[PDB]
Symmetry: C3
Subunit: 259 residues, 3 copies
């Protein structure tokens, strides 16, 4: 029933929500331009592979935020019986509607942006193909099951079941980052930079499942405008500054990553 | 206008349909646990690539059956004039509605699980990249056109044309299995086990298009409760037992697949 | 609401629109058969990789056109305020329905077919993995942001912003084709054939955003039936004849691209 235009207007009209989305369209767009400029001097192909994979992070991100701000990837869903937010209402302009604002566009595009973060990080750490494959596949599985959790309205139980399965996929990714690649990085001569990015990645990434559980999709203690800003803040660090730091290093150590 | 909740409880109250789904959520989960412990000894990166791709099959499966059981990946569609299922009703409770229950969730996830089965088999057979690429791309095409056949409600003829395209992609896959990898496995010293898994695969996979044609998607001589169980049986073999036989071999012959 | 059968019948009974779709289901089918027959003699794995990547182009295409003709991948969307097609009607079924017939199924399958055109071209040119990865990812982004633009009905400005993002991705692909692979083909020993296919591809691909801009999705100077024939005509060249020309070279020069 709810129109895309109505969701687009819902975002606008709500300063918190609007700012969380439009600021990242601008920041993601500025990042891409800055990163392209920063790596214009690279010559080595492997270094260039790391740079492109990294640049695709804000490319996917600017598209993701446009999808959310435009209302294309947002829906109003009614939570199942027992859910902390069942019976909630949203109100579009002058009409009130049952349900909560489900910004599934975030969970959907993470399946594209997070694999690129992992690919760049893995290559930076000199990972073999087997570990890259494992990290990336389970990362995608994590994102898609999380998406499924948000989209499930039939049962409150099923929603948290999806969430658990997603967490299990998340532990695999964490294992490879904290255990496997931390070791490979030393052998690749990138331990230093990897430690900084590994710590950043693990701490920031742990924040998403927390925000999800506290927002309307979970226990509903945080308003939609708050949960959104929390994700955008995480994105600013997990994506943009994370990419700046990686590329700043790459442009200064092109030779070490070459092989 | 049917709700996810209505589809969820529809699965309930229907013993055959419900059991065929929840039973595989458990069996797939149990498979994952068993496989992880069976492969804890592997150290060779190539041996571990084969193990992870094999483990991903039941990982895609728990999510797929959860999507089905939850009602997330099921819909009620009205079949086109001339279709044997056209004119049928379902009634999601007390208000009966026209159409048939379409478990497209199965066709959708196959595009993710079957490529992993093929990846494991190809690697085991010592396949080169060209053949792996060919098998996987045509397998995905097979699954996606099968999903399209099921979601097409406009024309009975179109539904079957889609089915034909899917069959042509399937022949490509069957060809690489029976002709190409069967030869490659000899060079890899895995002809023995490949011949076993190859036989199991071809025989089980061939059953899927038969079930489709017999069920509500085709001539509708079989009720969904039966078609769902047929697929579930096929999955138990084509996926879980297949995974066990491959992994049990791998753990006893890691030196063979290494390199 | 608007049913799949209604769109299917809409396509039928509309000579222009119907022909633009059914003609290509046929041409893509015949292309696949012809290409399979043409490449029968290939034995080198790298030569065969190029052939299979090329053949997948019409495979994805036949599936695409079936999705459009069946109505599966078509929808009626109402354009936002200020859009030159806002307030349009399509007359669907036995009633008049507001909006425009959006054949989004084209944009969706391009994300699968165009990367294959690029994979075959890049290999022909002896491209390293970095440039292939770059060409394919940005090409997929171009297609997906194009699909998003056509699917956006909330804001006229958002539609064109998506379009711009898509164009930016297109320039990346164009740069790799015209600058990078043009030079790599010289080392690969496929300078002449790559240059020919490079030019044909660049000229035809430039046609798509022009058609989008002129069609109902854009400034709406071209009705849906005409916008559809424009795309179908472009596909016949950029996909089917392009593939025929590439395979024609491949099967007479297998040794040149054999490498590894
Ligand atoms: C939408 C938007 C901006 C879009 C900008 C784009 C798409 C530019 C992409 C540039 C690339 C990918 C450059 C490639 C180089 C490598 C070149 C290569 C490997 C191909 O030789 C390198 C060193 C990584 O900068 C703004 C708002
Ligand atoms: C819908 C339709 C026709 C569909 C036809 C199909 C799906 C046939 C595909 C055949 C292939 C891909 C054969 C592989 C060969 C290579 C073999 C290999 C690499 C596997 O050894 C080669 C040289 C490329 O023809 C018609 C109307
Ligand atoms: C640019 C976005 C990033 C780096 C996103 C990261 C997202 C995650 C680590 C999400 C994890 C989740 C779970 C572990 C449980 C279920 C729900 C999710 C999807 C929020
Ligand atoms: C885990 C699932 C497996 C191994 C599924 C295999 C499925 C197939 C071989 C399906 C084939 C089909 C056709 C050849 C024609 C059209 C309908 C399908 C999708 C049932
Ligand atoms: C078989 C299809 C082919 C070769 C399609 C090519 C399509 C393009 C080059 C599309 C480009 C577009 C833009 C640059 C802007 C936004 C709209 C598009 C998708 C038409």
């Amino acid at each position: 029933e709810v129109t895309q235009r109505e969701l687009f207007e819902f975002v606008l009209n709500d300063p918190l929500l609007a700012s969380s989305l439009y600021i990242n369209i601008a920041l993601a767009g500025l990042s891409i331009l800055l990163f392209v400029f920063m790596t214009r001097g690279l010559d080595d192909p492997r270094a260039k592979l790391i740079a492109v994979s990294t640049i695709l992070v804000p490319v996917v991100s600017i598209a993701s935020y446009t999808g959310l701000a435009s209302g294309l990837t947002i829906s109003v869903l009614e939570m199942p019986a027992g859910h902390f937010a069942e019976g909630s209402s949203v109100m579009l302009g002058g009409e009130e509607v049952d349900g909560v604002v489900t910004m599934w566009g975030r969970y959907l595009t993470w399946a594209l942006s997070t694999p690129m973060i992992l690919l760049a990080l893995g290559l930076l750490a000199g990972s073999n193909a087997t570990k890259l494959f494992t990290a990336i596949t389970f990362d995608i599985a994590m994102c898609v099951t999380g998406l499924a959790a948000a989209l499930t309205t039939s049962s409150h139980l099923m929603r948290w079941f999806w969430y658990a399965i997603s967490c299990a996929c998340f532990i695999v990714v964490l294992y490879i980052l904290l255990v496997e690649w931390a070791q490979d990085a030393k052998a690749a001569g990138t331990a230093d930079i990897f430690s900084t990015l590994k710590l950043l990645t693990v701490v920031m990434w742990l924040g998403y499942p927390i925000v999800w559980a506290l927002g309307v999709e979970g226990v509903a203690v945080l308003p939609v405008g708050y949960t959104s800003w929390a994700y955008s803040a995480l994105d600013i660090v997990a994506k943009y500054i994370f990419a700046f730091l990686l590329l700043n290093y790459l442009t200064s150590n092109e030779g070490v990553v070459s092989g």
